[PDB]
Design a protein around this ligand. Structure first.
Ligand SMILES: Nc1ncnc2c1ncn2[C@@H]1O[C@H](CSCC[C@H](N)C(=O)O)[C@@H](O)[C@H]1O
Length: 353
DNA sequence: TAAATTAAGATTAATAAT
DNA sequence: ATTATTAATCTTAATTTA
């Protein structure tokens, strides 16, 4: 049978909502050590998560929309072998509604824009030409109490489609990098510096984790590892998993990071020093060049990995991709099988066979 | 020439309507 | 329950700025 997405998309449960599940039955092969945590977009071409689950020991994905953790939706699938009881959220949780998340916006927000929630944060931002087109469409009705319905429809659907917020008179503009940073749960200016351009900031932020969602899942690790963990971070990006562990106060004795973007590696190392991490950070570039024996050598030096965490590329899965939405075997999304290859090396030492 | 700008539909699912 | 309509969606690439 095909994988049906859960409605509501709350996974095994989210804060302040009914339907929390405290126990599941995992397949014997799925079982740690190591713990592992895999992330990707939920809204793939047909059959993709079935294949991902087949290669991750038939674990059913946990589908969670991050709108239950912040102001912006983020419908993601999570395959992991973590315990699911006694999760807790990092504090304080981010603002839940647009009204609280954008305090100045009530000055410009139209009554007929009924959004209390933003849509997914993506790598492609709305253009200044779109802002002008919306402004021009609304101005012939400035002294009218309300524009006609067909004009309202165009503006509303463009604000949703491009995740625009009202910032000036008849002015709907996309989110700023620091706003994306805060909604995704990163500290302010996390992706400012390290040679990252504003353009690259948009892409890296759009590709990243929602930290509060991932932290809520990883929270179960805190009683398990009082002395911290050795982490294998695959497709690290701007370090969503590391920020989550940091916010959970779970010591990272070691992070071996694999991330091909140089500016992303700079952002992660900047975070490592600015938060005064006492553990060691090791940075690799291309996962395709990371050999099995290197993983085994690292485990022999540092004593294995307690957690393997990563999200492999989505560009060949994402609905926004006009060119190469060819599925799991696309040039970038096929790097999922590199995640499985590395994970299997860790499992061979940790659990055997 | 790094950085910025802009527009380029299709695929599903969720929801509404028989 | 079945069908039709609405709705969301970790993007690529060509091009221009500066
Ligand atoms: N061959 C490769 N080796 C290593 N990393 C790669 C790669 N190809 C792509 N990547 C990286 O895979 C990442 C996928 S996006 C994942 C982002 C991460 N979860 C975060 O919190 O930010 C990107 O950062 C991309 O640069």
């Amino acid at each position: 049978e095909p994988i049906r997405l859960p409605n509501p998309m709350i996974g095994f449960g989210v804060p302040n909502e009914p339907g929390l599940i405290t126990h599941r039955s995992l397949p014997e092969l799925a079982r740690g050590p190591p713990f592992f945590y895999y992330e990707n977009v939920a809204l793939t071409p047909k059959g993709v998560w079935e294949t991902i689950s087949r290669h991750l020991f038939e674990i059913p994905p946990e589908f969670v929309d991050s709108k239950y953790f912040c102001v912006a939706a983020r419908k993601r699938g999570y395959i992991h072998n973590l315990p699911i009881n006694n999760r807790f959220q990092i504090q304080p949780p981010p603002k839940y509604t647009i009204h609280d998340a954008f305090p100045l916006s009530k000055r410009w927000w139209p009554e007929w824009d009924k959004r209390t929630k933003l849509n997914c944060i993506l790598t492609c931002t709305g253009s200044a030409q779109l802002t002008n087109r919306i402004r021009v469409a609304l101005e012939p009705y400035n002294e009218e109490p309300e524009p006609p319905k067909h004009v309202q429809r165009y503006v509303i659907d463009q604000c949703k489609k491009w995740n625009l917020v009202w910032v000036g008179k008849n002015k709907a503009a996309p989110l700023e990098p620091d706003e994306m940073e805060s909604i995704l749960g990163f500290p302010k200016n996390h992706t400012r510096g390290g040679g990252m351009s504003r353009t690259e900031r948009f892409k890296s932020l759009g590709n990243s984790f929602q930290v509060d969602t991932v932290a809520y899942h990883l929270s179960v690790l805190k009683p398990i590892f009082p002395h911290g963990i050795n982490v294998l971070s695959l497709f690290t990006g701007i370090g969503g998993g590391e920020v989550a562990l940091h916010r959970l106060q779970i010591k990272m004795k070691l992070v071996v990071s694999v991330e091909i973007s140089k500016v992303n590696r700079n952002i992660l190392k900047d975070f490592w020093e600015q938060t005064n991490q006492t553990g060691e950070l090791i940075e690799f570039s291309d996962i395709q060049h990371l050999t099995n024996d290197t993983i085994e050598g690292l485990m022999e030096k540092y004593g294995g990995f307690d957690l393997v965490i990563g999200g492999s590329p989505c560009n060949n899965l994402a609905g926004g991709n006009r060119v190469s939405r060819v599925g799991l075997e696309g040039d970038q999304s096929s790097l999922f099988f590199e995640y499985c290859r590395i994970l299997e090396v860790v499992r061979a030492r940790m659990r055997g066979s």
